[PDB]
From a paper:
Imidazoleglycerol-Phosphate Dehydratase (IGPD, EC 4.2.1.19) is inhibited by 3-amino-1,2,4-triazole (3AT), as well as the experimental herbicide, (R)-2-hydroxy-3-(1,2,4-triazol-1-yl) propylphosphonate, (R)-C348 and other compounds including β-Carboxamido phosphates and Pyrrole aldehydes. The predicted ORF of Acanthamoeba IGPD gene is 594 nucleotides in length and codes for a putative protein of 197 amino acids with a predicted molecular weight of 21.4 kDa. The conservation of the oligomeric state is critical for positioning the two imperfectly repeated metal binding motifs (D/NXHHXXE) from each subunit on the molecular two-fold axes of the particle, generating the 24 active sites that each contain two octahedrally coordinated manganese (II) ions. The monomer also shares the typical IGPD duplicated fold, with a bundle of 4 α-helices sandwiched between two anti-parallel β-sheets.
We further demonstrate that known inhibitors of IGPD, 3AT and (R)-C348, act to restrict the growth and development of Acanthamoeba and we determine the structure of the complex between Acanthamoeba IGPD and the most potent inhibitor, (R)-C348, to analyse the molecular basis of its potency. Within the active site the inhibitor binds with its N-linked 1,2,4-triazole ring positioned between the two manganese ions, with the N2 and N4 nitrogen atoms residing within the coordination sphere of Mn1 and Mn2, respectively. The C3-OH substituent group of the inhibitor acts as a second non-protein ligand to Mn1, with the sixth ligand position around Mn2 being occupied by a water molecule (HOH1) that has been proposed to have a key role in accepting a proton from the substrate’s imidazole ring during the initial stages of the reaction catalysed by IGPD. The residues from the metal binding motifs complete the coordination of each metal ion; Mn1; H67A’, H40A, H162A and E166A and Mn2; H66A’, E70A’, H138A’, H163A with a Mn-Mn distance of 6.6 Å. The phosphonate group of the inhibitor sits within a predominantly positively charged pocket surrounded by residues from subunits A and C, which include K170A, R92C and R114C, and a water-mediated interaction (HOH5) with H48A. The extensive network of hydrogen bonds surrounding the phosphonate binding site is completed by S191C and K193C from the C-terminal loop of the protein, which occupies a position that essentially shields the active site from the external solvent. In the Ac_IGPD/(R)-C348 complex the conformation of the C-terminal loop and the interactions it makes with the phosphonate group of the inhibitor match those observed in previously determined complexes of Arabidopsis thaliana_IGPD in complex with the substrate IGP, whose mode of binding resembles that of the imidazolate reaction intermediate.
Author numbering:
A (entry chain F), C (entry chain H), D (entry chain G), F (entry chain L): 3 to 197
B (entry chain J), E (entry chain I): 4 to 197
The structure:
Amino acid sequence: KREAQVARETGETKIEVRLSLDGTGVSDVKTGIGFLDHMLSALAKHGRFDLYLRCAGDLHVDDHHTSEDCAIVLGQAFRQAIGERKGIKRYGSAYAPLDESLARAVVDISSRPFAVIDLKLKREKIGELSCEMIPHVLHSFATSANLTLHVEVLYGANDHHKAESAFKATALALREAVTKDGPADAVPSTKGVLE
Amino acid sequence: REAQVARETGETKIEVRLSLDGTGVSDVKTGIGFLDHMLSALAKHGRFDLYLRCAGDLHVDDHHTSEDCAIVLGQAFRQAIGERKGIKRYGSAYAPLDESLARAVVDISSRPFAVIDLKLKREKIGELSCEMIPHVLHSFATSANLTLHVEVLYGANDHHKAESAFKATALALREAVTKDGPADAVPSTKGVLE
Amino acid sequence: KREAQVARETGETKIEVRLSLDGTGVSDVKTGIGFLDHMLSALAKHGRFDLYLRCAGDLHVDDHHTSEDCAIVLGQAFRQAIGERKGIKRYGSAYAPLDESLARAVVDISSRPFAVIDLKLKREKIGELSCEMIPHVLHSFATSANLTLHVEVLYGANDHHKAESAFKATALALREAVTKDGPADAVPSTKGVLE
Amino acid sequence: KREAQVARETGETKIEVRLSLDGTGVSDVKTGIGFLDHMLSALAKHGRFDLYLRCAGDLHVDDHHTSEDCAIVLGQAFRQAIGERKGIKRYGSAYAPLDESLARAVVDISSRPFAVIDLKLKREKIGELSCEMIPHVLHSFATSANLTLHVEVLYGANDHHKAESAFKATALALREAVTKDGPADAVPSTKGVLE
Amino acid sequence: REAQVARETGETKIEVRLSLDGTGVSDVKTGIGFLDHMLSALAKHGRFDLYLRCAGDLHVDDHHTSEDCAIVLGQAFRQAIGERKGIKRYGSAYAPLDESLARAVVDISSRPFAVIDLKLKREKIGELSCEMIPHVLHSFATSANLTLHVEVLYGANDHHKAESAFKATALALREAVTKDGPADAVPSTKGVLE
Amino acid sequence: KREAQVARETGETKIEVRLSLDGTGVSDVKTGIGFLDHMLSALAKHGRFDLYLRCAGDLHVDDHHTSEDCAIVLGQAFRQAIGERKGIKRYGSAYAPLDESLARAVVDISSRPFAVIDLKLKREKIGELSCEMIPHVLHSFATSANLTLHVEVLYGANDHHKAESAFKATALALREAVTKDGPADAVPSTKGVLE
Ligand SMILES: O=P(O)(O)C[C@H](O)Cn1cncn1
Ligand SMILES: O=P(O)(O)C[C@H](O)Cn1cncn1
Ligand SMILES: O=P(O)(O)C[C@H](O)Cn1cncn1
Ligand SMILES: O=P(O)(O)C[C@H](O)Cn1cncn1
Ligand SMILES: O=P(O)(O)C[C@H](O)Cn1cncn1
Ligand SMILES: O=P(O)(O)C[C@H](O)Cn1cncn1
Ligand SMILES: [Mg+2]
Ligand SMILES: [Mn+2]
Ligand SMILES: [Mn+2]
Ligand SMILES: [Mn+2]
Ligand SMILES: [Mn+2]
Ligand SMILES: [Mn+2]
Ligand SMILES: [Mn+2]
Ligand SMILES: [Mn+2]
Ligand SMILES: [Mn+2]
Ligand SMILES: [Mn+2]
Ligand SMILES: [Mn+2]
Ligand SMILES: [Mn+2]
Ligand SMILES: [Mn+2]
């Protein structure tokens, strides 16, 4: 019932996403970048979202337009799947480790696009995904989802652990934030409106 | 789980009605608009129902009003919980507002204590002095007879910092007073929460 | 009910534990060290675990082999009680204070033994339990339980408050992580296996 | 005969290892990552182990799951091959240089999984093996082998020399630790048990 | 290669029997359990057989007991070696215990000397004062008439540090006293090891 | 028998060396510099080498050409005495103290000439051997022996003790490295060649 399909095409990328918020965690993601597929796969699995994604992008240039545009379209789908912002918890937070790494994510379904991202990534790339694109993906996702997202890797020593723990924490926090809670028609805001 | 408290001194005359198992509605008139907004947010995100009126000595400053509102609110919270059994006891939450992020942690401990760190930079937000904001939280915690930790981890806008703090506090309080497990269990290894 | 009984003996210690994860918080714990007893009693109480433990140890040497071996056996019991790692939340986190002290624990039922522990204890002992054994207990528990455990005392000033807040937080995080959630046969991992 | 065959399958990797502790140094290792194959070949050669390894892994993501899971299975095979922990030296240590680099490894067949690893690598990758995975390999090996491993690169200027000197030292130290020494049934522990 | 030594003062009364070519068995009763554990580890990992009893002045503190036990143990070790010929002379080893790592280096030199650095942080381990731990190793080396270097390179648990140090010492002593090469050869360019 | 003789003459020095690797520690060394004789005598004794050496050198200039050329000739002799690099341990390491001084030596019979030497000598001369010539002797030995040598004085306070502990440690490491071990035809390298 809470789902969305979004298609988007530019000169750089051509993307389709299908998203169900009330899923079982199944993913079929092919961005053209394996490590990004793994991160979005983790996001779906731990968020209990169902996610289908295809991207034909300009990887001959670099991984940037693909990664950013996948995040944009994912964010748009999440926004649409949420629907009217009523009857939900609105706020979610979670910690997820991976071995020595620990990450925290905090989500506010605010209708104010904003993100604060600090992943402490040390390397240049994880597989074929540039580390600089990893915060960019979370920022672009948050702004297109029209929500407020804070993600911090508190510490760690392995960048795959850092990134993955961040996606896992993000997934758990998003899941909590969009959970139905209390009266179905209550807007969870003192101003009575979440656009 | 509702309580009504009335309290009058030479500085302030206050009435509060608080229900723990509400829908978030509030009617809060402290005399200070920003404080009203903070307690409205507390009620909204705690799913508490809160009525509050204060006739206070604002011609002096905002201090006695804000503190006493916190004192009476805390007394009402303590009373509304009633016997400290069958509840989660511990709650914690994060709430942002844009660039600011706050955490609140609550222990329904019967030991009044607060650790508050809001990183507010300004002198006032509207007519509420920034120094009164941690004082409100501390006074609330002590009169509620509980342990409260509130940290603004970072931010750049004092309205965002303060409001994120009240939202996080609301969420943690809601969790801590949630009924969970056997109704008669005291959630303490010492068997007593006074 | 998810329960386990474990008996272990070496030349240093002879220990028996019985643990139920789906308990009411009852404990009957006698390790030979009162403060360790109190910490394990707080663990069971706030975890809603039921815990029986006896240790006949070598306290004439010091508190080390007793404390460590109690953690090993408790960890083994926890691992065995969880049984097949399916149908559970897998991730838990919690904060617990005690007056001026605040602790955070994060749990990942990962089948990867790992612990990151930072308790900020200033004393040599609390009662008859050496402070250096308190992180060792958490690390040994985590590794024998085959899970990932992160425990941090953020701040405080009383070592009994710090240690107890740590065990309380740990309890609450373990309780969340082992809570049944979603389809009973789902393995909460993108790799489909948690051994 | 001190030998083992171990197989392991997840959604990320499918691996088989065959190992003899009392070998001549022969290796047939194909992880999918040439530099890792070279390190493991070195380990077998200088440890006088015989090692066969095959991994079908998710290298399209990155080198992490392959490398980690190869180390996990290798460690498990080591644990099994040692068998009952009696009649062996238990402790091993060795230094190995490669030109300007010098490494030390220390092994304790302890039945307590722990590793302390400090390789001082400066690069992002050596061949297709990410440098961050090299400590992760040694740590995962040690924990799966249920032993205590300390490896330090003391100094050096070339990461291939640093990593290779570390595997060489590890090989020599492991060879020493599992060498039969003294009465066949003596347990090398004051507590009389090494599980 | 066995020796028996008995020593009595107004502080302590000690008997030791030590065999170098043992299986690692021990019966050590110093009156201090953690010291017993360390000397048991020493015997076990050195493949020495060690008997020790001490009736000491533990009402004062652990010092005279611990020191005199090390003194007598060292004297026994010196005597058990006998004429310093046909041995390796030099020994070294590392031993960890979990996060801690120690190194010991032995030279059967007939020059009493020790360099000890265990990085212990606590005041006591059980009833053995941490400051007595290096003193034990030093007093052992001087009475054994040898050169001993023991370093805890790093660690975080003092029982692990001390225990790793005794294990490494044991392994190094075992190597140093191992028979190797012609039985009459003195392992010194000066042709004498007194 | 693993023995060699080398005779070498330049306008600066005239040297004859005879070396046996499988000796009893006997030496007869006359370099012209007593302290250097004492160091090479210690090396022979603790390596269980037999060594004869005579140098007629330009001591009226300084100790340099003598000390370096003795090291060169000795290294050449060591290389010839080893012969085919097969059937040996290849790697050796050792610590030797002398009173307050402690030194570590590590040897790799690598066929790659390289030395890393750090003796921490404070004086100008020990007897008639200039302190700067002591690391020069070790480096020139290693490079002429065609092997990798690392020697460190970890600490100390007496330069005779530091130097002598260094030569003792070197001797012990060299003895271990050239010890016969395993099949006599095996080449102890993954590349199958030690030239
Ligand atoms: O978070 P909201 O939109 O529910 C209500 C806030 O009062 C709005 N706000 C935005 N900046 C400061 N306050
Ligand atoms: O948190 P409680 O009151 O349930 C039990 C604690 O053991 C009491 N305590 C308070 N300071 C130290 N311990
Ligand atoms: O957390 P898991 O085992 O469910 C899946 C991870 O992808 C495995 N992993 C372990 N290190 C890096 N990734
Ligand atoms: O190393 P072991 O297990 O042979 C004997 C040790 O006494 C056990 N131990 C583990 N931590 C402190 N001691
Ligand atoms: O180690 P030794 O006694 O075999 C021979 C040394 O040369 C003696 N010495 C002691 N200080 C300096 N040299
Ligand atoms: O140490 P070797 O020559 O047995 C084999 C090495 O792989 C060769 N090498 C030299 N530099 C890097 N590797
Ligand atoms: Mg010749
Ligand atoms: Mn961009
Ligand atoms: Mn992964
Ligand atoms: Mn006041
Ligand atoms: Mn506002
Ligand atoms: Mn221990
Ligand atoms: Mn307590
Ligand atoms: Mn990993
Ligand atoms: Mn190489
Ligand atoms: Mn003394
Ligand atoms: Mn011990
Ligand atoms: Mn020169
Ligand atoms: Mn000398």
